[PDB]
Design a protein around this ligand. Sequence first.
Ligand SMILES: *C(=O)CCCCCCCCCCCCCCC
Lengths: 150, 161
Amino acid sequence: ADEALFLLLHNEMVSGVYKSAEQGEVENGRCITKLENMGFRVGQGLIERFTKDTARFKDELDIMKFICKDFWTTVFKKQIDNLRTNHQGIYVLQDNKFRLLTQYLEHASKYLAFTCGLIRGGLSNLGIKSIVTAEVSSMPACKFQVMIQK
Amino acid sequence: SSELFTLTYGALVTQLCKDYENDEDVNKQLDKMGFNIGVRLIEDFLARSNVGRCHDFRETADVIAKVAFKMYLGITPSITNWSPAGDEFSLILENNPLVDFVELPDNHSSLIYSNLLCGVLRGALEMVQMAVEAKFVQDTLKGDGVTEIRMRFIRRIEDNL
Ligand SMILES: *C(=O)CCCCCCCCCCCCCCC
């Protein structure tokens, strides 16, 4: 399916079904979680699909390297531009031109939530529990923070 | 590839089934979303194609089946079942285009798995001033031999009021 379709679905999910009417934090939180959770499922399924070489990572840094190169390339047709880490569970994945901020953008962090899930679900299937957050650091970029859970 | 789209669509359907607990409400939301998407997609399609106006609904059918489906989903349904009036036609597909699998047992009898495509089709055609009804009348995922989207021309949308 042309990526046009994915970009429009993503935009429609963020701006339609799962845009918060900004009633409060609870609504915002719930809308956010729905997107992120969906992303989580898609992330899982992309791994299943394109990565039944689950044996050949054999450790965290290789796994974050895979996310940065192969996984990002699967979803966004390019790699992340910078991987930084503290070597204590936190990784920051910089996308300088984040593709899902193209459909101005006030609610732009909503547009990151699905992708945070993508990464989380992708890591979940590679053996890693994480919390994944994101912010636009300097539009159109975009750092995703992966904190790995003990 | 857009294993991506199907996986993303599938997660959306699954999420909506969790939220709604009524397959008819999932169907409506999907349709609603598809319409919203189609309205924007027709812009993309017209810019990417150099497709002009369709002087008929038969000509509209050829574009949809031969150019548009091919562009977005990489397939080409056949056009069958013309009404004598020339105001309804069927699109036949070998499989369900947005969805590969179905969980068993079936707890979603009413669910129209790819109803988004019907919103998409109606929104897109609205923007070229054709009021249409698109609906699944067969689905392989419902055990039918093929998937069939019946397209029905309702009216040309009036310029102005
Ligand atoms: C003649 O002027 C009529 C133009 C017809 C425009 C066709 C646009 C329809 C796009 C729908 C194709 C299906 C792919 C979408 C999958 C969800």
